[PDB]
Design a protein around this ligand. Structure first.
Ligand SMILES: C[S@@+](CC[C@H](N)C(=O)[O-])C[C@H]1O[C@@H](n2cnc3c(N)ncnc32)[C@H](O)[C@@H]1O
Length: 254
């Protein structure tokens, strides 16, 4: 579809609005000193506005502007342009393509679990760091973190996010093995999925010091047994369960 931009407020343009509608306008929005009128394709109008086709880009900018802070006590996840009067801990994440915006339930379960199981001074491994939000949160709690991901594309955004938050976790491409050289760790947090955790259970144990913690999420309610089963079999002890919707987080001690 096309947009027809016009300078002025709705109040101001009220006089020609009926005309826009007669011209076939199906949508209308006031966007920062401007009024956008949406049509299927351009039509001839006397208002001296400017036509422009709408695309995926515009559809994000619009979404971006409708974004609101997300709570995850004791944290609040904010867009780089968000304001927060509250007391919760600020986590600035550029709404991007890398997972970790703070809008998914799993991310939220992870943040809350981290605050409970992480202590000032702990070494942390954020397996599948994505946006790097969990690693960033670990540094905010007073921990030293390493975020890894098999997807290279996310690391610059993670690094950029860390920067916005004024903390500097270590980020690197790879999985659990790429990380071992930096271990063992006091805590490991991983937002993946039930089946993969199941296969990794054994390595999770080797990644942690005795008494270390493993926070697993990305788990659907109906796939938790796989994890309970794999973890126990891996010598871990159950410590906490949490869910939001169909998603759950399982915390284990080693
Ligand atoms: C659910 S996203 C993480 C989102 C963010 N860490 C959070 O807590 O919201 C999972 C990330 O893990 C990565 N990933 C998937 N399989 C992986 C694997 N086997 N090893 C390491 N990272 C993996 C992906 O590239 C993806 O960015």
């Amino acid at each position: 579809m096309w947009v027809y931009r016009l300078k002025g407020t709705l109040e101001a343009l009220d006089p020609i609005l009926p005309g826009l509608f007669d011209g076939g306008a199906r949508g209308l929005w006031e966007r920062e000193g401007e009024v956008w009128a949406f049509f299927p394709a351009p039509v001839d109008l006397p208002y001296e506005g400017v036509w422009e086709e709408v695309g995926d880009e515009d559809w994000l900018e619009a979404w971006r502007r409708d974004l609101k802070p997300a709570l995850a006590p004791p944290f609040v996840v904010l867009a780089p342009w968000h304001t927060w009067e509250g007391a919760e801990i600020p986590l600035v994440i550029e709404p991007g393509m890398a997972f970790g915006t703070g809008h998914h339930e799993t991310t939220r379960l992870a943040l809350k679990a981290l605050a409970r199981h992480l202590r000032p001074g702990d070494k942390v491994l954020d397996l599948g760091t994505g946006s790097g939000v969990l690693a960033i949160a670990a540094e905010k709690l007073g921990g030293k973190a390493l975020g890894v991901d098999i997807d290279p594309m996310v690391l610059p955004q993670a690094e950029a996010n860390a920067k916005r938050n004024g903390v500097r976790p270590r980020f690197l491409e790879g999985s659990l093995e790429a990380a071992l050289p930096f271990g063992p760790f006091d805590l490991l947090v991983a937002n993946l999925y039930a089946e993969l955790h199941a296969a990794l259970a054994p390595r999770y144990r080797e990644a942690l010091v005795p008494g270390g913690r493993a926070l697993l999420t990305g788990i659907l309610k109906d796939r938790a047994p796989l994890v309970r089963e794999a973890m126990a079999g891996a010598g871990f002890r159950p410590l906490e369960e949490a869910a939001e919707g169909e998603w759950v987080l399982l915390a284990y001690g080693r």
